[PDB]
Write an enzyme that holds these catalytic residues in place. Structure first.
Site, PDB file in Angstrom:
ATOM      1  N   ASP A 178       1.242  -0.149  -0.195  1.00 57.77           N
ATOM      2  CA  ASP A 178      -0.019   0.632  -0.093  1.00 57.77           C
ATOM      3  C   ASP A 178      -0.240   1.370  -1.393  1.00 57.77           C
ATOM      4  O   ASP A 178       0.569   2.222  -1.747  1.00 57.77           O
ATOM      5  CB  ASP A 178      -0.056   1.659   1.048  1.00 57.77           C
ATOM      6  CG  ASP A 178      -0.214   1.040   2.396  1.00 57.77           C
ATOM      7  OD1 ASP A 178      -1.063   0.126   2.525  1.00 57.77           O
ATOM      8  OD2 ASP A 178       0.490   1.480   3.364  1.00 57.77           O
ATOM      9  N   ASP A 226       6.732  -1.153  -3.597  1.00 57.58           N
ATOM     10  CA  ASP A 226       5.855  -0.634  -2.536  1.00 57.58           C
ATOM     11  C   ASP A 226       4.599  -1.536  -2.363  1.00 57.58           C
ATOM     12  O   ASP A 226       4.281  -2.404  -3.209  1.00 57.58           O
ATOM     13  CB  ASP A 226       5.407   0.733  -3.076  1.00 57.58           C
ATOM     14  CG  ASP A 226       4.456   1.408  -2.131  1.00 57.58           C
ATOM     15  OD1 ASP A 226       4.852   1.453  -0.844  1.00 57.58           O
ATOM     16  OD2 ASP A 226       3.369   1.862  -2.541  1.00 57.58           O
TER      17      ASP A 226
HETATM   18 MG   LIG Z   1       2.305   3.485  -1.596  1.00 57.64          MG
END
Ligand SMILES: [Mg+2]
Length: 291
Positions: free
Chosen positions: A45, A43
């Protein structure tokens, strides 16, 4: 032979591990295989970027536009009101993850919809990003740099905005050849102004779907059967559903928020849990032994 006890990066108080012997055996598989069998699935963010700085909350990809100069206070009010009513659903203890799917679809659609209204030019994303308060996790030059150096596949899989993400990494100098970015990419009209989003929507709960729809990429990497997965949501645990074959997979979770309510669950599902942690040093330490 791996001894977590003798890696100072694992002695930091933010490191939680349900099963240290299990983790040692996984890392030992990682080391044995070396560069040839490794790939990263990650991932962005709040995993590669920071959740907080100097007492202050750090922006997601989406927040970078929400907060920029091309967007009105009246748009920001609306966006906040969506966060209020939809984030409460996201985190609702009673609804099953499956029941939250249609809600998430609505939230991201509506908020992307408000940004299409603001009129965002492509030409402007460079400046917006430069002026923003975004920050990468401490240790990112090293993370990306050892990985490029050894030509290790990095699959960044994001429910953010891909044009924004890519600009962040390009301005950091770490968007190398080995880094593939799968996200919600903007669709531009012939004036180069945002009109909508490409493809099918990636949100927090449906990365299984996207992971299986990138078979191309994963089948090219059949030999890369050792994986390191990094996320901060429970949903990020699905990001490896598309992988050809798995020999060893290590799952590292950023628990940024809701620490008391979620610790047990995070410790149960992620192999290593990093509590309120703004660096990549535990993963860098694994890379140093492995690479
Ligand atoms: Mg995230």
């Amino acid at each position: 032979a791996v001894h977590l006890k003798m890696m100072p990066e694992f002695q930091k108080s933010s490191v939680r591990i349900k099963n240290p012997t299990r983790v040692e055996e996984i890392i030992c598989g990682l080391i044995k295989g070396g560069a040839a069998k490794l790939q990263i699935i990650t991932d962005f963010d709040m995993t590669l970027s920071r959740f907080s700085y100097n007492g202050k909350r750090c922006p997601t990809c989406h927040n970078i536009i929400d907060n920029c100069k091309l967007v009105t206070d009246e748009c920001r009010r609306k966006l906040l009101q969506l966060k209020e009513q939809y984030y409460a659903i996201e985190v609702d203890p009673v609804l099953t993850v499956e029941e939250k799917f249609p809600y998430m679809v609505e939230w991201y659609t509506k908020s992307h919809g408000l940004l299409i209204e603001q009129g965002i030019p492509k030409a402007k994303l460079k400046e917006i990003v430069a002026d923003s308060d975004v920050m990468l996790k401490e240790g990112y030059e090293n993370f990306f740099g050892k990985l490029q150096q050894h030509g290790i596949p990095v699959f960044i899989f994001s429910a953010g905005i891909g044009d924004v993400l890519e600009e962040v990494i390009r301005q950091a100098g770490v968007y190398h050849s080995n880094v593939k970015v799968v996200s919600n990419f903007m669709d531009f009209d012939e004036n180069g102004v945002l009109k909508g989003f490409k493809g099918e929507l990636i949100h927090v709960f449906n990365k299984h779907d996207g992971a299986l729809k990138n078979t191309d990429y994963f089948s090219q990497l059949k030999d890369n059967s050792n994986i390191i997965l990094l996320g901060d949501s429970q949903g990020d645990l699905r990001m490896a559903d598309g992988v050809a074959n798995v020999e060893h997979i290590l799952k590292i979770g950023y628990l940024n928020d809701r620490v008391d309510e979620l610790l047990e669950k995070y410790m149960d599902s992620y192999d290593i849990v990093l509590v309120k942690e703004e660096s990549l040093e535990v993963v860098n330490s694994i890379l140093q032994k492995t690479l």
